[PDB]
Structure 1
Amino acid sequence: QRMWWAFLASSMVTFWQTLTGRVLVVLVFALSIGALVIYFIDSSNPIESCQNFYKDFTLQIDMAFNVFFLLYFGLRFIAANDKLWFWLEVNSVVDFFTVPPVFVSVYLNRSWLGLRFLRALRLIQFSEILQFLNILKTSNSIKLVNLLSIFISTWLTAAGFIHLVENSGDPWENFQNNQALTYWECVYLLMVTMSTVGYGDVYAKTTLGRLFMVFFILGGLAMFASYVPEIIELIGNRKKYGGSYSAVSGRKHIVVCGHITLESVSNFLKDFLHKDRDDVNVEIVFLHNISPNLELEALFKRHFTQVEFYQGSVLNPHDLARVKIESADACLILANKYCADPDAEDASNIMRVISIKNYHPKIRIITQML
C-alpha cells in the first residue's frame, strides 16, 4: 500500500518541421487537452480507487490516449539523437514522469491522480501552429498568445500540485490531517497568492504545502514582475487604421494626401466643411505614414461622420487600391512649405502625381507647389 518504488522507477529518476511533424504535434496537444479535460472531470473523485480492465468505460478513452502517448514516447526515442540532452529536455522529463506512472497504475489496476495533470506544459504548442493555421500571422499577437499559454500552463500545474498536497496530508502523520477542498477552491487560493491580496479565509493547512508555496510565490512574483512589463503595452501598439474604405453608392468622396499636420488639416477642414455652403456630401480620407496625434484623433472624432483616416503611402499601388481612388471624384495634395529645400517638396509632389496618374490616368488632381 502507498507504493512509491514503482511510481518513481516509472518516472525514471536515475538517468526500418514539415506536415509530418505538424500532424503529430497537433495530435499531441489535442490529446493533452482531452486528458486534462477528463482529469478536471474526475478531479472530484478520490485519488485512490479500484479499476478493472473492463470496468471504467470513461478510462478506455484514457487508455487510447495512453497508448497514443506511448507512440509519442517511441517517437521521442526516434528523435532523441543525443541521449544526454534527450533526458535533459524538460518536456521529455514531464512525459517520463507522467506516462510510465500511468502504465504502472493500470498494471496495478488502481487509480492514482498523482502528477497526472503534468501534460499542461504541452498546452503552449498550439500558439506556434495558430500562425500556420493563418488565424494570427503577426508577431506581437502570437507572442501574446504564447505568453498567456505559458501563464495558464503554470496556472493549471500549480493548481493541481497545491490540490494534491492539500488533499494528501502529512505522510509522517499518517496523512490524516489533510483538509478537503475542490479544484476550484485551490484555483481561488492560488489567485489569492498570486494577486498578493491575501484573504486568508481558507489557507494551505499542510506544512509541506506552505513550505512549497513560500518559494513558489517568490518565483511567481518574480516572473509576474518580469513579464507584465511586456504584457501591458500589447493592447496599445496595435494597428487601427489598416482597413480599407467602404464606398457608399450615390455619394462621392475625395482623397487628401501629402504632408498633413495639425494646423494644416484644421484650416482645411474649417474652410471646407463651412456651414455656409449649399450642400457638402463628400467624404474626406487621409493617407500618411506617421500615426496621427491625439489632437488629430480628436478632430476625426468631432468630425466622425465626415472624415475618415487610413495609414499608407501614395507610392504604394496596393494602398491606392485599398483607398479605392477609382470612384473618387478628385485627389488633393498638401505640400509642406517650411522645410529648408523647396525643390524637395516639388519633386515629392511630382512622384505623388506620377504614381497617382499611373494607377489611374482619368481622375482630377489639385496640388500645392512652392
Structure 2
Amino acid sequence: VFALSIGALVIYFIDSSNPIESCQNFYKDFTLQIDMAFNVFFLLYFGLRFIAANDKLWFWLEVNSVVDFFTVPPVFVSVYLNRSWLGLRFLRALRLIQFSEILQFLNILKTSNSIKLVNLLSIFISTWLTAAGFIHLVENSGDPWENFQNNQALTYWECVYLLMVTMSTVGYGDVYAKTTLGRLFMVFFILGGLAMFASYVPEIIELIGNRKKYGGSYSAVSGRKHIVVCGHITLESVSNFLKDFLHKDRDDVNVEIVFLHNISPNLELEALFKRHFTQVEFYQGSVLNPHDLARVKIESADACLILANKYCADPDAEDASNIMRVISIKNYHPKIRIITQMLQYHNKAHLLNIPSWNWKEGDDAICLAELKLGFIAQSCLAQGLSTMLANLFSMRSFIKIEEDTWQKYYLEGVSNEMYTEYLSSAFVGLSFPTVCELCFVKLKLLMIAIESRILINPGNHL
C-alpha cells in the first residue's frame, strides 16, 4: 500500500503534463495498464478494510474511503472507455495521510516527536498537492458563465509554485488565478492554508535539528593521563578549578581534564572550554549511568573529582547526591581514585563505610565543615594561621607594585605555595635542622616536614 500510493501519485504527475481530455489505447498504454493494476490492488485493500470495519457507515464516511470512491471508479471507467480525463486524479495525494499510521503498524514509528513530525509532513504535503491539483483543474477549464473562454494555461508545477507563494504570504503576483472559480477557491484557501503554513512550518523545523551537540565519548591518548570531573559544574566552579589546576607555577604537567555533566553548557561555559580547547573536553551525560562512565573512559582515568554545591539549600540532600555519585562510580570501577567534597562530617562517616572506599589507596573526602572548624581552632592557638594555611594551597604568581603599602608585603608572602618532592643524597646523613638552615637561603627553600611516616617539624635527633 505504501509503495503503490506513491506509484499512483507519480502516475498522476506524469499525466498532469498531457491535455485535459484525450483518447488512448488501453492495449497499447503501459501507464494505463499499470494504473489499472494499481487500482485493482486499491479495490482489494478497500474490500479488506470494509470487511474489517466495525461500523460500516462510519467506515463509508472515513476520508480514505472517500479518497477511494473519488479515485478508483474513474480509473475503471477510463479503462472501459479507452479514454482519459484528468479530473479529480489529484485526490491521489490524500493517500499520504495514512503513511504515519501504516508506519506505526510496522513498528517503525515509536517516539512521539517522530510520530508528530511524520504526521505534520504528510498533512502539509498532501494538502499542498491536492489544493494545487484542484486549482490546476479549475484554472485550465474556464468559467461556464464565460463559456470556458477565460481559461488560463497553467501547468501543475506552476500551480504548485503559486500555492507555495500564496501560503507563505509572499505573493509575487507573477502567477495568480484569473478565473472566477479559481479566485473563489483562492479566497477559501487563503483562510486555511496560511494558518496551516504559519503553524506547521515552525513546528516541523523545531522537530528537526534536535541533535545532541555534546555526544560521543573521550578517546584516550597513549602516554598521557586524563582526569574526569563531575558533580557541581557551573561557569564559576569550572573557571576557579581550571585557574588552580592549570597554573603556571606547577611543573609541565599534561593531564587532560574531562568534564561529565547532565546539563548542556551555556554560551559562557562553551566559550570557557574554547579558551582551554587543547586541555579540556566536555561530554554530556549522567555520572549514575554506566554507559556514560564508559564513555568518559573512567576505567582508565587517573582520578575522579566530584565538586559539591557549597551554597545548596539542603546540605543533607547535597550530601546524599554526592554519596550516590560516589556509589555509582565505585560500583562501575572499584579501583578509581575519588576526590570529593563533603559538607558535613556525619555524612562523611556514612560515606566511608562503602566497601570500595579505600582511604589508603588515595580516596580523599575533603570535609568542608571539618577543615574550616579546624582552621578556626588553629587561629585560636595563633591568630592569622587560617589565612596562612589557606594561601599555601591557592596557586598564585608574584605581583609587585611601586607603592609602599602593606599590600606589597602581603602579596610577596602570598606568592608561595606548599609543594612535595624527593631530596638529594647530598643531604642524607645530616640532621633535619641542619638541612633546613642549608636549604633556607642557599637553595632558597623552606622545609616544614619530611616523609613514623608523616612527621611535622622533626627534632634535631632525626
Q: Please, what TM-score do these two structures have when normalized by structure 2?
A: 0.68
Name the stretch that deviates more: 232-241 or 318-327: 232-241
Distance in 2, Cα, partners of 1:255 & 1:133: 43
Name the stretch that deviates more: 217-226 or 56-65: 217-226
Distance in 2, Cα, partners of 1:246 & 1:131: 38
SS of the counterpart of 2:306?
strand
Report the CA distance between 1:340 and its aligned residue. Answer: 4.1
Report the CA distance between 1:180 and its aligned residue. Answer: 1.1
Superimposed CA distance per residue, residues 125-178 of structure 1 (whole angstroms, 9 cap, x where no aligned partner) = 444555677877543233223212211111111111111111122234442331
Distance in 2, Cα, partners of 1:197 & 1:41: 29
SS of the counterpart of 2:263?
coil
2:183 aligns to what? 210
Report the CA distance between 1:276 and its aligned residue. Answer: 5.5
Structure 2 unaligned blocks of 5 or more: 343-461
Distance in 1, Cα, partners of 2:308 & 2:131: 61
Could you say if the C-alpha distance between residues 30 and 241 of structure 1 is closer, same or farther in structure 2, counting changes exceeding 3 Å? same
Distance in 2, Cα, partners of 1:130 & 1:112: 33
Task: Give the one of 276, 281, 303 matched to 1:308.
Answer: 281
Name the stretch that deviates more: 133-142 or 102-111: 133-142
Distance in 2, Cα, partners of 1:134 & 1:335: 44
Equivalent residues of 1:331, 1:364 under 8 A apart: yes
Report the CA distance between 1:71 and its aligned residue. Answer: 1.0
Could you say if the C-alpha distance between residues 83 and 341 of structure 1 is closer, same or farther in structure 2, counting changes exceeding 3 Å? closer
Report the CA distance between 1:321 and its aligned residue. Answer: 2.4
Could you say if the C-alpha distance between residues 342 and 203 of structure 1 is closer, same or farther in structure 2, counting changes exceeding 3 Å? closer
Report the CA distance between 1:256 and its aligned residue. Answer: 0.6
The higher-RCO structure (CA 8 Å, 6+ apart) is 1
Distance in 1, Cα, partners of 2:144 & 2:317: 82
Equivalent residues of 2:302, 2:337 under 8 A apart: yes
Could you say if the C-alpha distance between residues 135 and 264 of structure 1 is closer, same or farther in structure 2, counting changes exceeding 3 Å? farther
1:245-264 equivalences under 5 Å are: 245-264=218-237
Name the stretch that deviates more: 227-236 or 264-273: 227-236
Report the CA distance between 1:255 and its aligned residue. Answer: 1.0
Task: Give the one of 85, 98, 117 matched to 2:58.
Answer: 85
Name the stretch that deviates more: 344-353 or 47-56: 344-353
Could you say if the C-alpha distance between residues 229 and 201 of structure 1 is closer, same or farther in structure 2, counting changes exceeding 3 Å? closer
Report the CA distance between 1:236 and its aligned residue. Answer: 7.0
Distance in 1, Cα, partners of 2:104 & 2:12: 29
SS of the counterpart of 2:227?
strand
Could you say if the C-alpha distance between residues 86 and 205 of structure 1 is closer, same or farther in structure 2, counting changes exceeding 3 Å? same
SS of the counterpart of 2:264?
coil
Distance in 1, Cα, partners of 2:322 & 2:233: 13
2:30 aligns to what? 57
Report the CA distance between 1:368 and its aligned residue. Answer: 1.9
Equivalent residues of 1:51, 1:109 under 8 A apart: yes
Superimposed CA distance per residue, residues 55-93 of structure 1 (whole angstroms, 9 cap, x where no aligned partner) = 112222222111111111211221222111112211111
Could you say if the C-alpha distance between residues 136 and 76 of structure 1 is closer, same or farther in structure 2, counting changes exceeding 3 Å? closer
Could you say if the C-alpha distance between residues 72 and 248 of structure 1 is closer, same or farther in structure 2, counting changes exceeding 3 Å? farther
Could you say if the C-alpha distance between residues 332 and 68 of structure 1 is closer, same or farther in structure 2, counting changes exceeding 3 Å? same
Report the CA distance between 1:232 and its aligned residue. Answer: 4.9
Name the stretch that deviates more: 318-327 or 82-91: 318-327
Name the stretch that deviates more: 62-71 or 276-285: 276-285
Aligned residues between the structures: 343
Superimposed CA distance per residue, residues 244-303 of structure 1 (whole angstroms, 9 cap, x where no aligned partner) = 334444443221111112101111122223456554444322222333222222223333
Name the stretch that deviates more: 284-293 or 328-337: 284-293
Q: Please, what TM-score do these two structures have when normalized by structure 1?
A: 0.83
Could you say if the C-alpha distance between residues 245 and 59 of structure 1 is closer, same or farther in structure 2, counting changes exceeding 3 Å? farther
Equivalent residues of 2:36, 2:76 under 8 A apart: no
Report the CA distance between 1:332 and its aligned residue. Answer: 0.9
Superimposed CA distance per residue, residues 198-224 of structure 1 (whole angstroms, 9 cap, x where no aligned partner) = 221232121101101101111112223
SS of the counterpart of 1:366?
strand
Distance in 1, Cα, partners of 2:67 & 2:248: 71
Distance in 2, Cα, partners of 1:349 & 1:273: 25
Equivalent residues of 1:124, 1:146 under 8 A apart: yes
Distance in 2, Cα, partners of 1:280 & 1:145: 52
Distance in 2, Cα, partners of 1:101 & 1:304: 67
Name the stretch that deviates more: 329-338 or 270-279: 270-279
Distance in 2, Cα, partners of 1:82 & 1:164: 35
Name the stretch that deviates more: 245-254 or 358-367: 245-254
Name the stretch that deviates more: 189-198 or 289-298: 289-298
Distance in 2, Cα, partners of 1:318 & 1:131: 29
Task: Give the one of 181, 189, 192 matched to 2:154.
Answer: 181
Equivalent residues of 1:255, 1:286 under 8 A apart: yes
Could you say if the C-alpha distance between residues 126 and 351 of structure 1 is closer, same or farther in structure 2, counting changes exceeding 3 Å? same
1:77-226 equivalences under 5 Å are: 77-127=50-100, 138-226=111-199
Name the stretch that deviates more: 234-243 or 284-293: 234-243
Structure 1 unaligned blocks of 5 or more: 1-27
Distance in 2, Cα, partners of 1:77 & 1:136: 25
Distance in 1, Cα, partners of 2:339 & 2:293: 17
Distance in 2, Cα, partners of 1:173 & 1:36: 32
Identical counterparts, % of pairs? 100
SS of the counterpart of 1:286?
strand
Distance in 2, Cα, partners of 1:313 & 1:166: 60
Report the CA distance between 1:341 and its aligned residue. Answer: 4.2
- Larger Rg over CA atoms: 2
Could you say if the C-alpha distance between residues 166 and 337 of structure 1 is closer, same or farther in structure 2, counting changes exceeding 3 Å? same
SS of the counterpart of 1:44?
coil
Name the stretch that deviates more: 239-248 or 98-107: 239-248
Name the stretch that deviates more: 88-97 or 124-133: 124-133
Distance in 1, Cα, partners of 2:250 & 2:126: 62
Name the stretch that deviates more: 350-359 or 279-288: 279-288
SS of the counterpart of 1:114?
coil
Superimposed CA distance per residue, residues 217-245 of structure 1 (whole angstroms, 9 cap, x where no aligned partner) = 11112223344564454357653334333
Could you say if the C-alpha distance between residues 278 and 149 of structure 1 is closer, same or farther in structure 2, counting changes exceeding 3 Å? farther
Name the stretch that deviates more: 47-56 or 334-343: 334-343
Distance in 1, Cα, partners of 2:107 & 2:277: 33
Report the CA distance between 1:343 and its aligned residue. Answer: 4.1
Distance in 2, Cα, partners of 1:346 & 1:197: 59
